[PDB]
Amino acid sequence: EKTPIQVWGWDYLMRQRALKRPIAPHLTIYKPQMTWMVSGLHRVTGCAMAGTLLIGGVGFSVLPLDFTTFVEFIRGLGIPWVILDTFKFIIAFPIAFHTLNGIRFIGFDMAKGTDIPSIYRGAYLVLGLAALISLAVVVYPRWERHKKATLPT
Amino acid sequence: SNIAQYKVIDHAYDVVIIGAGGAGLRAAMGLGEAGFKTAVVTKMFPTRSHTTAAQGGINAALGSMNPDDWKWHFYDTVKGSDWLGDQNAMHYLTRNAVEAVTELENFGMPFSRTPEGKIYQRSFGGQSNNYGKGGVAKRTCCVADRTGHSMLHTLYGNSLRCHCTFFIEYFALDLLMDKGRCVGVIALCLEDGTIHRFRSKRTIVATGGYGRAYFSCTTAHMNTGDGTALATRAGIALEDLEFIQFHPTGIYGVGCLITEGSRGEGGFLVNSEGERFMERYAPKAKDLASRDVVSRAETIEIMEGRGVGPEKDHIYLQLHHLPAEQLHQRLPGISETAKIFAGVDVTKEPIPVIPTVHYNMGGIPTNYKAQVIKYTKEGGDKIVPGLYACGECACHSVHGANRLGANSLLDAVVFGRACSINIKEELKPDEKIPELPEGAGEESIANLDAVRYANGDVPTAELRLTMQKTMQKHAGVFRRGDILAEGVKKMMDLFKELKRLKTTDRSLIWNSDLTESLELQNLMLNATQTIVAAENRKESRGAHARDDFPKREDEYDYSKPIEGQTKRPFEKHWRKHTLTKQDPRTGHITLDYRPVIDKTLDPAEVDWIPPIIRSY
């Protein structure tokens, strides 16, 4: 159900194909900027999580595996005190960064914070709190279990 | 057209417009309104047309700031034309100025507003209330610093409603002629290298001027004065070509315009000694004296050494004394423009400026109906059928020897509007669309086919440069008989190098090398005619000032009282238009001269102003 202009826009795209006309480059050539790199990482993560929820929700359902076997399977190698929390940080950050940025990416739908200072500030602001909250959430229980090896009671 | 084959494409319209500048678009809107199948042909997108770069404002006696009579506008415009201006055309201009600019507000032009909510006007060069007696006039209505950008975008937008069909990026090669009658236009569609023949009952020329004939210019690269050349290649005399206005405040480096609005807001010109030197050269007007004066007044200070900077060769424009909340409000365009190209914080430093080529009053000769004319010495003003002109490429003339400040955007509009007004009437719907004679502009193409595969040993790029300089030198603000002779000698020998041309680019589709070559072709016609006219004009008047003939040559000496004297014959005195008639192929130029139309249109509505000595 297209508006008259968007009809024309198609017929055009055809006519443009007709002429075997090449298309200018874009991702190939355009420079990294914190405007759209952030856009990427909002949408990259946004999806990754949904694909997890599918690969998780439907994967563990169709497979005989319950989750309790999986949690045990990895403790099989019992990977280093580090490499676990790495993967915890990798799992917090897509939720952290995204959800924060969601408040920011809503902002620019309202014209709220759309000047280049407000854009570039918010970019670091969101990455700051996502780095904080994901590190803090991951290195808090880890620093509570090594607060057993030596503790009062 | 032997060395290739060409895709020829006919059309049939009522009226073709070669031009999508202020005049062309206004002209189109009125014709759409009238209901004509109107084809607008332009060699670039209409928003890119020059008008866009216009800054200062557009003139009308609105009195948004204070009482104003358009007759005071009319006066300052006739004195601005140094009585080389056909006043019947100027009467039309200044009468309807208030209607036309009001129209533009009513087309959604976002004019800067006064607290009253009216269209904010500023002061400008060469205007004054009470017929030169009263104060400095505020008629120059504006969209702050960027009036021409907003006028064009507005005019264009409104022309998307006129049901007018746009041919964009089509380089017009020739006016298609049938023994006296303009039956249409021929062009090259850049997009696919096809050739297009437009059959039309009328043809409006709104191509703009030839600013690139000189080296330094505020003009845009596409100011190659094509329409002016088209008329010549169709066999028409061009008018007042030697009158080239020099804008005072062009930036020292690139030559980009710093507006006269910058002066009309309270800025001023300062030499190496820190003197607001315009207070000498103009006791009354000062830095808002007419451009030919201010630009001369600059050159005098330079040529006497009080020029500024490391070459003592340009001067300053001063804005670091106006309050910064006005600079930003009234001059944001030039603010940044200066900050980019000059690196100047205009609130802290002055802007290095210099006289610069800007507007060509000179153009294709017309009457007040914006109709192209030929001038026999016996038959008089015999019109050209199916042909109209307006804008910078025309010479009605409303500017005679010196264009007034902020008057052209108006000239573009009012006479664009005039084109349709005048056509709506004198065209009748029984008149069938004229058929083309067989093999029309088979030459137009041949010419193209030549330049396309240009075989000689002179790069098109280099032949231009040497034209531009050969010009820059000889036809400056101050010119002299010996220089000009010596200029004409070089320019006519540069013309013979056209047969020795080189172009590498061979393709039909978007050949900016070929098209630019056709521009040079057109520029060389304009240029040659500009300087032979100047060389021959033995007087100082308006922009054209002769060291060897520094008095204004008139019928009477006008400093002395009128009666008692005895009127000179037409031959001796120079109150007359310069009508160069070039042989397009060979390059020979012949002249002839045509009277200034002193009468108004209605002696009942206003009186024709007697030539007095032009002082500011």
């Binding site: 159900e1 929820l53 | 069909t165 297009h196 023949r197």
Partner: protein, 129 residues
Amino acid sequence: TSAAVTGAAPPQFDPIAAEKGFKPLHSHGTLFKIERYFAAAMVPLIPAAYFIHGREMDLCLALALTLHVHWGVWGVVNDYGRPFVLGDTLAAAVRVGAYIFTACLLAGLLYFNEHDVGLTRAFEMVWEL
């Protein structure tokens, strides 16, 4: 030579003539509104999931998550699932797939709440490693 063919006027969009008939007022605008509301509502929710675990939270998560991701994937399917680069019906396949993805998602999440640890408990257990 001038043994030309007569051509036609160049393809151009008439905004006045396109104004004939055009009544489309399928104001998507009010739908956008609710997408964002909902997502803003989820701003407190993620903290709530961290702190208040459980099966009934899983249900709020799996209901909201399936609803917000549904809206989300539909967006990304329109951007990249283009008729131009896929051909019409093949683009309709991805288009429909964006709805298949949602329904498979919810069921995937519902099965996990009702026959496994549940969302909340799954995080506790992996954070426990």
